[PDB]
Amino acid sequence: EGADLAKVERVAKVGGLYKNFTSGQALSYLDGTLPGDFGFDPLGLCDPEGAGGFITPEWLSYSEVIHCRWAMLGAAGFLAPEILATAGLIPATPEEAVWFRSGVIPPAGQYGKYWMDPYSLFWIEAILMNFAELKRWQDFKEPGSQSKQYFLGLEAVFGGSGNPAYPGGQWFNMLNLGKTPEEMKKLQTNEIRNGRLAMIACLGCAAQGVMTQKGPFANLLEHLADPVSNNLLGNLATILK
Amino acid sequence: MKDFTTYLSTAPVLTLLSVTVVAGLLIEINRFFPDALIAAF
Amino acid sequence: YLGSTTNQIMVLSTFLPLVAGRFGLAPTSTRHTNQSGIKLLPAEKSAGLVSNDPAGFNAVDVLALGALGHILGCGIVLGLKSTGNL
Amino acid sequence: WGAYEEPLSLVAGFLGWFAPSNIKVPAFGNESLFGAFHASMLENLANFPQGPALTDKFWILMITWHLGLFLALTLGNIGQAARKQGY
Amino acid sequence: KVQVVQPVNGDPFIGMLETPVTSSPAIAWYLSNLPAYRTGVSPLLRGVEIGLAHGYLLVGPFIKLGPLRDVENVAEIVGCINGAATVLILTLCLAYGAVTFQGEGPQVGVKTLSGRSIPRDPLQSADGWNKFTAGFAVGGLSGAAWGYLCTQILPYY
Amino acid sequence: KKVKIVVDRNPVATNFEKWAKPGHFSRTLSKGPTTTTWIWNLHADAHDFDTQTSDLEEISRKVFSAHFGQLGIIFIWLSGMYFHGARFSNYEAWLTDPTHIKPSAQVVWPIVGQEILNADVGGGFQGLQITSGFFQLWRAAGITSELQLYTTAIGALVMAAAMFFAGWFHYHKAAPKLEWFQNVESMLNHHLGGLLGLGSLAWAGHQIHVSLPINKLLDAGVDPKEIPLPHEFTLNPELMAQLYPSFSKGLAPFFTLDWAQYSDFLTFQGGLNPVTGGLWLTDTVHHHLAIAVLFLIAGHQYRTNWGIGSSLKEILEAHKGPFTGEGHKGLYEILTTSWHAQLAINLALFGSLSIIVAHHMYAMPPYPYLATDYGTQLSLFTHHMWIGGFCIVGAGAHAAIFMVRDYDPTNNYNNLLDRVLRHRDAIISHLNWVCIFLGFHSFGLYIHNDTMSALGRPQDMFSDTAIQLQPVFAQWVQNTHFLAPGFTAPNALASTSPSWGGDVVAVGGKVAMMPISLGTADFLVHHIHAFTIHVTVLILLKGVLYARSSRLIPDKANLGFRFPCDGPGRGGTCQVSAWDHVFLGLFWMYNSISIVIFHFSWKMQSDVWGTVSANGVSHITGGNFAQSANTINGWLRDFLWAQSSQVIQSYGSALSAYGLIFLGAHFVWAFSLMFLFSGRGYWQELIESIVWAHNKLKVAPAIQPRALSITQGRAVGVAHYLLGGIATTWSFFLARILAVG
Ligand code: CLA
Ligand code: CLA
Ligand code: CLA
Ligand code: CLA
Ligand code: CLA
Ligand SMILES: CCCCCCCCCCCCCCCC(=O)OC[C@H](COP(=O)(O)OC[C@@H](O)CO)OC(=O)CCCCCCCCCCCCCCC
Ligand SMILES: CCCCCCCCCCCCCCCC(=O)OC[C@H](COP(=O)(O)OC[C@@H](O)CO)OC(=O)CCCCCCCCCCCCCCC
Ligand SMILES: CC1=C[C@H](O)CC(C)(C)[C@H]1/C=C/C(C)=C/C=C/C(C)=C/C=C/C=C(C)/C=C/C=C(C)/C=C/C1=C(C)C[C@H](O)CC1(C)C
Ligand SMILES: CC1=C(C/C=C(\C)CCC[C@H](C)CCC[C@H](C)CCCC(C)C)C(=O)c2ccccc2C1=O
Ligand code: SF4
């Protein structure tokens, strides 16, 4: 093989370390069409040859965008309560406003002051998410659907577009941001990069919570106070204490 | 549905269901009328 | 722990295989050995790997050489501290 | 060789004349594998009159030393006759 | 690159192969120097040698394992037992010779591995087997007799 | 080139159209059931995917889906085991008294007086005594409660559903292509490190955070309902540190290469735990961690999508010497295109592994309160022995199948396979001679001892009192292992097993393990085992080597792998195919395994199992093996007749079932003789007369009744013979061990 020179040139223009991890196999299908395409695929999962089931370029790209958005929401939700509590804006102590102590994991702590118990909340959550996710999936299977059957008049904004990850109709794109194709591509790149950073941040928050038993903001402040001592290597002695 | 009912009508399926029904009937007869050594009418 | 004998041995035992494989002294993802195992063959680029290093030292080479160096260093350190030295 | 067709070349004497150079190295405990084997051979009778009893130190020492010597002999013969492992 | 396994006498369509066990120089020499593979030696002498060796090696088993092994007179009893065994295998040889050699037929020739024509072994004949059988009796009985003498002599034993 | 996931979308539609058409997979079963032979042929070729299609891709897909279905079935079985242990068992009560309460996990309904089978096991519970060892396994895992068993059962049901869905998905939705299955390098790399290595590491982690604390508290003596829950130990280094002080340092010693600090829970002691009688859980944790690291390292040798790695084909083709001509060339093509060759290799090693497992498990009891449970020990040993023997016979069968169908002379020229096939006569003749020599010098010794004993000459027998046949080699190896600690294993505190020698390990008044002395009887039985194994190997190897051709039949390969014969010509060619060789090998394997299990049972009941009364060890049979196992009469009287009184006197008690099966099995076995000594012609003519009787009353069926084929007759006879014999031994063993254990 020995790469293709011209194909590698595109990845080289991306900058950073996007070149030391690219390969000739990945460059055969990663031509930069999709936003965030930096030629990274050492395992060749998005190879269109022999694709099927859930291992397809369309499904994988859609899943990556969905994960990006969910991770951005998760990271913002992981940092907002602790930051607001550390400043005294909300009537919750910083150790009680941690994300893993809200009630998601009762053994790790739970907030027993909600308007109703977490299990019933999950029941309502399951019904609502079932509706939303099932409609989104049916739209992915049949793009023209979801806008034909009556749905209290909301079906008028479920027409979608060609790309399942970017419906952006009357509701999903209220402000009509990114009117030109180039601007939309740039904004999509921003969204993909932010979502990837949020995914990495969410995984880091989970790891830190398991190893430090504290919140992300608390970990950042303690690391800033003493970086040489408060770090991964310095916290190996006490991981679940 | 027709193919499923046709499969259920095959010799092995029907044989196992018939044997199971007969065995169940005999077991319940012996459960409600146990130790029937002779035909006492 | 930093700057100790164990740290020095681990760092050296991990970095040496990396420099060896980069200067054509240890097998990598481009240069392999024949059936004998002691004769390095010319670099072959059939794997399609790409890297910015002038000699072609890819990332897979870093992972493989680092893993081997870590295994050797761990064994050396354990043998040294389990025998009286170190 | 003079007789047979034995591929055991005369130049291959390094097998049996080099294995002791490595088996004589001390192993911390006792004094050395070959040293202990030779001492047992010269002490627990000259491996001919009476006997090494049942399961003695001499038995394990002899078995281990012969195991190493035989493996070195055969592997070296294979390697030498294979010409840098040309097979 | 050497192939130690070759077809028998280069012919690959004969039910036999040449291996370092069958075509080994030392093995071939030792096997060829046995009294059984002597086409030019009288069958009687070869039979005497074979009988002597067999009779001598046949005493030991009964000496150390016979029913009367725990008695001082075990050597004599065993000498007699070996004599009986030799006589039995003697009648076996005679029966085999009388059944095998009873007719004549224009058999095919015999050649060596190189291709040199050689006559058939005289042992494979009516008179050849009889002479070999007679020598086996004298040698077999002598071997058993010598087995008893070795027990009495032999300072080590 | 380049390992990747290649899959075909929706290849087979999901419907019941073919469910209503039996015999759709076979082309020869399309003319309908004209005779009753069609019904048997429908089941005899259901899983013979090689005949249903000529495409290797479809065969591979069928095998993959069948594997998923088998996994689902195994998961259902596991779920049932856990559910029964959680709802119809006395596990909770057994935990408080594991030395007196007999494990039970089955309860029968009262219908026809069968409620007598609900034995008084203990702990206010009535049920059937189980010998699977599940209670010991659960205790070693720290289950403690019944809710955990129920949760495991539900999880197993979910896993079974997932397995079935996976099979359906991979056969009807996303079916992998042939090139995906032929990735032996990737498959080996994932099965070595990702499967074995990762599984061992995960089990070690569970043992460290769940098994070690719970079991330590149980051994020290604490009520099971008072021990902290597993999560309280897995997520609290303070309590776990209270139990294991090395944990106060966290993970720092592991990353600083100061592993010695972890010596409290990562020991290399040896022997068995004197409280429970099993292996030290810390030693097992250390073992699993070491093997996990080894497997993970081994899972990085084969080359895949990168330059690094080795090539199986390159390694195989590079191993050739002067005595093997071409060498291993062509083996890679055989193992990457023939499923039968892989099945043969896997079955052989799999059965051998099962046998090794049986040996290592009785020698070194790995679970707590397992050695003192004689019933469980004997049952596990015998079960694994039978599984291993069956798998080995199957390996020989599939080797013959490959040699008949997938063999190709153009691809195997002057290689190992060709050279082996070119001198099969020498191999078979030498194996036949060694089998005869072993049979003589092994069975004739027993016959000689019997004759001497009957003649009033015990001084002429091959016993420890007269002509001794001491196994000096085995005794030397045993003593070497006994002296290993502190010498050839300085970091070992004790030997691997107490059988090598030493003191007696007894738990709850019963001997858990003790030195096993080897004498003349052991020498004789070991040579008997060698002889039987050699004969079985001779039969299987002869079938595999002559499956293609032979001097009698030069075109045996054309007739196929499974055919009855080649007519009565040439004197007779009955049972000349490879299938028949497997048919005979099954009988010989049964004989070998039967003698092996008999030897194990008698040896453990006479020199190991027993009770300690501060004055010595009172074995179950009093040690009569060392003085009676040298004759056949001793085996018939002191073992078969003496130990059978437990099964023939079980009527009217809880073990009555064992007394019933014991007889039933005897029937099935004898029943097999009808199919083994008969022929097809007799039954066909008898069926002709019965058919005439049916026609006389207008009740003859259109599906013309036919006698079972010659091959089917042999298969039925062998199946019934082994079922009857194995079930007889099973009933005898279980009744005897449950009545005196
Ligand atoms: C056990 C054997 C097995 C094997 C060899 C395969 C092999 C394959 N599967 Mg499959 N599968 C299996 C079992 C198996 N599967 C089971 C039991 C299920 C039911 C749950 C499925 C359901 C399934 C679906 C729905 C799909 C596949 C697909 C595929 C193909 C691509 C998968 C891939 O590599 O992408 C990547 C693999 C992953 C992303 C897996 C990561 C997520 C899992 C949950 C990781 C956890 C596993 C680990 C053991 C958990 C440990 C415990 C944890 C606490 C650490 C591939 C050929 C895909 C396909 O058709 O490709 C064309 C596809 O869509 N499989
Ligand atoms: C920084 C992260 C980020 C970025 C750069 C983008 C970018 C984009 N998104 Mg996306 N989105 C995100 C996060 C992000 N999103 C998250 C976390 C979710 C989960 C809720 C979504 C869910 C989502 C959907 C469902 C859709 C998009 C769409 C789009 C595209 C439309 C243009 C646009 O609105 O620009 C984005 C502008 C910004 C990111 C700047 C706003 C930043 C502030 C803090 C947000 C404040 C919002 C607040 C609730 C306003 C309330 C009142 C308001 C209505 C006036 C664009 C490329 C649509 C599309 O594909 O068009 C075809 C579309 O269908 N997004
Ligand atoms: C409801 C779901 C469903 C349906 C409708 C089908 C339908 C079909 N399948 Mg399919 N399949 C399924 C699920 C399903 N399958 C699952 C879950 C798997 C994974 C195991 C498979 C794997 C599979 C393979 C590999 C193949 C098919 C094939 C077929 C086609 C014909 C074969 C057939 O069904 O004969 C009828 C089958 C039965 C009536 C049942 C089979 C016997 C069961 C599995 C035994 C279970 C053991 C049970 C415990 C008893 C053993 C112990 C007992 C003695 C007590 C057919 C259209 C074949 C095909 O395409 O034809 C060329 C093909 O080869 N299937
Ligand atoms: C780390 C990766 C991995 C793992 C864990 C496995 C594990 C397994 N493989 Mg698999 N395989 C892999 C990679 C892997 N494989 C790859 C890369 C290939 C392509 C070269 C294959 C091709 C392959 C074939 C052709 C077959 C298997 C089979 C099996 C099963 C053997 C049954 C057994 O004895 O184990 C013990 C059983 C268990 C532990 C049951 C638990 C199962 C859990 C869920 C493990 C599932 C792992 C799976 C790979 C996760 C990804 C699936 C995801 C997409 C949902 C086993 C569960 C055989 C089989 O039985 O088919 C199913 C078989 O036929 N594999
Ligand atoms: C992983 C193990 C494995 C696998 C996958 C296979 C797979 C296969 N084998 Mg094989 N085999 C195995 C192990 C295995 N075998 C073992 C261990 C043996 C030694 C006994 C054999 C001996 C063997 C022979 C002799 C033959 C095969 C054949 C075959 C092929 C056709 C099977 C078929 O559909 O027949 C039909 C399957 C059945 C009729 C199932 C019947 C189950 C038996 C008869 C009942 C046993 C009773 C059971 C224990 C429960 C008793 C309770 C009862 C009272 C209800 C097939 C590819 C045949 C072939 O032609 O190869 C191409 C062939 O003739 N095998
Ligand atoms: C097994 C589990 C592990 C999962 C691994 C598989 C996931 C693969 C993800 C790898 C990334 C792929 C290639 C990215 C390629 C890539 O890097 O992209 C470049 C990266 C992202 O920048 P952009 O995407 O904006 O690049 C465009 C511009 O850079 C143009 O020049 O920029 C960086 O340099 C940040 C990365 C620094 C790395 C952060 C680590 C900081 C920690 C330092 C710690 C010091 C001490 C360490 C002691 C321990
Ligand atoms: C008691 C031992 C248990 C094993 C049973 C031994 C009986 C089997 C005898 C059959 C021999 C058939 C000859 C095949 C002839 C044959 O295969 O051709 C010769 C064979 C071929 O080697 P090549 O030079 O072709 O090597 C290239 C290979 O990569 C390709 O095969 O080399 C051998 O000598 C194999 C060794 C056979 C001898 C095995 C005995 C090993 C001794 C093990 C002793 C264990 C106990 C003592 C340990 C201290
Ligand atoms: C690229 C590539 C290529 C090659 O070839 C292959 C491979 C290697 C495979 C690759 C890679 C991959 C990766 C890296 C992955 C990763 C991922 C992640 C991390 C995700 C996350 C992701 C993440 C996520 C989603 C997350 C999310 C989150 C969330 C929702 C949260 C939520 C919450 C909140 C708010 C708060 C509260 O209190 C709690 C809760 C309720 C909990
Ligand atoms: C009895 C006998 C028959 C006759 C047996 C026949 C025809 C089989 C009869 C089967 C009947 C039709 C079913 C009986 C059902 C039983 C109650 C249970 C059978 C188990 C099945 C479910 C597998 C042969 O055909 C034969 C052929 C070759 C050698 C020996 C023999 C042989 O001994
Ligand atoms: S008796 Fe039966 S198996 Fe034997 S040759 Fe005749 S038909 Fe064939």
PDB file of N, CA and C in Angstrom, chain F residues 39 47 66 90 94 96 117 177 200 258 286 297 306 348 353 361 386 426 570 576 619-620 629 644 666 675:
ATOM      1  N   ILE F  39     -37.802 -41.228   7.495  1.00  0.00           N
ATOM      2  CA  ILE F  39     -37.901 -40.570   8.794  1.00  0.00           C
ATOM      3  C   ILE F  39     -36.555 -40.585   9.504  1.00  0.00           C
ATOM      4  N   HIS F  47     -27.906 -32.080  10.770  1.00  0.00           N
ATOM      5  CA  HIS F  47     -26.762 -31.218  11.034  1.00  0.00           C
ATOM      6  C   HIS F  47     -25.588 -31.464  10.097  1.00  0.00           C
ATOM      7  N   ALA F  66     -25.626 -22.314  14.772  1.00  0.00           N
ATOM      8  CA  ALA F  66     -25.815 -23.479  15.627  1.00  0.00           C
ATOM      9  C   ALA F  66     -25.065 -23.292  16.936  1.00  0.00           C
ATOM     10  N   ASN F  90     -31.547 -26.225  49.868  1.00  0.00           N
ATOM     11  CA  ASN F  90     -31.220 -25.926  51.254  1.00  0.00           C
ATOM     12  C   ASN F  90     -29.828 -25.313  51.332  1.00  0.00           C
ATOM     13  N   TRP F  94     -27.392 -25.132  54.350  1.00  0.00           N
ATOM     14  CA  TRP F  94     -26.138 -25.852  54.166  1.00  0.00           C
ATOM     15  C   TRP F  94     -24.940 -24.970  54.486  1.00  0.00           C
ATOM     16  N   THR F  96     -24.645 -22.828  56.930  1.00  0.00           N
ATOM     17  CA  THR F  96     -24.415 -22.837  58.368  1.00  0.00           C
ATOM     18  C   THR F  96     -23.832 -24.156  58.855  1.00  0.00           C
ATOM     19  N   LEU F 117     -38.677 -40.212  47.622  1.00  0.00           N
ATOM     20  CA  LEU F 117     -37.394 -39.747  47.114  1.00  0.00           C
ATOM     21  C   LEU F 117     -36.927 -38.469  47.795  1.00  0.00           C
ATOM     22  N   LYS F 177     -19.392 -13.262   6.017  1.00  0.00           N
ATOM     23  CA  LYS F 177     -18.918 -13.901   4.801  1.00  0.00           C
ATOM     24  C   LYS F 177     -17.819 -14.913   5.123  1.00  0.00           C
ATOM     25  N   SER F 200     -10.074 -14.559  32.712  1.00  0.00           N
ATOM     26  CA  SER F 200      -9.303 -14.886  33.903  1.00  0.00           C
ATOM     27  C   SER F 200      -9.065 -13.642  34.746  1.00  0.00           C
ATOM     28  N   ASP F 258       6.083  -2.622  43.236  1.00  0.00           N
ATOM     29  CA  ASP F 258       6.318  -3.153  44.578  1.00  0.00           C
ATOM     30  C   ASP F 258       5.202  -4.136  44.924  1.00  0.00           C
ATOM     31  N   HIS F 286      -4.028 -15.583  42.775  1.00  0.00           N
ATOM     32  CA  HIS F 286      -2.710 -15.375  42.194  1.00  0.00           C
ATOM     33  C   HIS F 286      -2.560 -16.172  40.904  1.00  0.00           C
ATOM     34  N   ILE F 297      -0.621 -11.744  27.014  1.00  0.00           N
ATOM     35  CA  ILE F 297       0.620 -11.592  26.265  1.00  0.00           C
ATOM     36  C   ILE F 297       0.611 -12.509  25.048  1.00  0.00           C
ATOM     37  N   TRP F 306      -1.692  -4.954  11.019  1.00  0.00           N
ATOM     38  CA  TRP F 306      -0.453  -4.207  11.156  1.00  0.00           C
ATOM     39  C   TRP F 306       0.719  -5.113  10.806  1.00  0.00           C
ATOM     40  N   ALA F 348     -10.338 -33.597  20.196  1.00  0.00           N
ATOM     41  CA  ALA F 348      -9.294 -34.377  20.855  1.00  0.00           C
ATOM     42  C   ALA F 348      -8.717 -33.621  22.042  1.00  0.00           C
ATOM     43  N   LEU F 353      -8.455 -32.413  27.783  1.00  0.00           N
ATOM     44  CA  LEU F 353      -8.532 -31.394  28.817  1.00  0.00           C
ATOM     45  C   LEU F 353      -9.549 -31.781  29.877  1.00  0.00           C
ATOM     46  N   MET F 361      -8.925 -32.061  39.672  1.00  0.00           N
ATOM     47  CA  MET F 361      -9.952 -31.736  40.651  1.00  0.00           C
ATOM     48  C   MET F 361     -10.001 -32.745  41.787  1.00  0.00           C
ATOM     49  N   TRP F 386     -16.024 -39.487  31.445  1.00  0.00           N
ATOM     50  CA  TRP F 386     -16.884 -39.894  30.338  1.00  0.00           C
ATOM     51  C   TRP F 386     -16.945 -38.828  29.253  1.00  0.00           C
ATOM     52  N   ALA F 426       3.068 -49.677   8.457  1.00  0.00           N
ATOM     53  CA  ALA F 426       4.021 -49.801   9.555  1.00  0.00           C
ATOM     54  C   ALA F 426       3.421 -49.304  10.864  1.00  0.00           C
ATOM     55  N   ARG F 570     -14.867 -61.213  -1.326  1.00  0.00           N
ATOM     56  CA  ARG F 570     -13.538 -61.120  -0.724  1.00  0.00           C
ATOM     57  C   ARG F 570     -13.545 -61.679   0.693  1.00  0.00           C
ATOM     58  N   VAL F 576     -16.295 -52.090   7.275  1.00  0.00           N
ATOM     59  CA  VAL F 576     -15.002 -51.723   6.708  1.00  0.00           C
ATOM     60  C   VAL F 576     -14.827 -50.213   6.587  1.00  0.00           C
ATOM     61  N   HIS F 619     -10.719 -46.263  56.788  1.00  0.00           N
ATOM     62  CA  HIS F 619     -11.184 -46.140  55.418  1.00  0.00           C
ATOM     63  C   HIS F 619     -12.525 -46.844  55.234  1.00  0.00           C
ATOM     64  N   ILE F 620     -13.217 -46.472  54.156  1.00  0.00           N
ATOM     65  CA  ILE F 620     -14.538 -47.028  53.876  1.00  0.00           C
ATOM     66  C   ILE F 620     -14.470 -48.539  53.679  1.00  0.00           C
ATOM     67  N   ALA F 629      -6.894 -56.182  44.652  1.00  0.00           N
ATOM     68  CA  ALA F 629      -6.963 -55.674  43.286  1.00  0.00           C
ATOM     69  C   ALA F 629      -5.996 -56.359  42.331  1.00  0.00           C
ATOM     70  N   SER F 644     -22.039 -53.435  45.795  1.00  0.00           N
ATOM     71  CA  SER F 644     -23.350 -53.365  45.162  1.00  0.00           C
ATOM     72  C   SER F 644     -24.494 -53.551  46.147  1.00  0.00           C
ATOM     73  N   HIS F 666     -29.615 -52.022  33.246  1.00  0.00           N
ATOM     74  CA  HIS F 666     -29.273 -53.400  32.915  1.00  0.00           C
ATOM     75  C   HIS F 666     -30.124 -53.898  31.766  1.00  0.00           C
ATOM     76  N   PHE F 675     -29.811 -55.545  18.810  1.00  0.00           N
ATOM     77  CA  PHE F 675     -29.396 -54.802  17.633  1.00  0.00           C
ATOM     78  C   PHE F 675     -27.942 -55.043  17.260  1.00  0.00           C
TER      79      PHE F 675
END
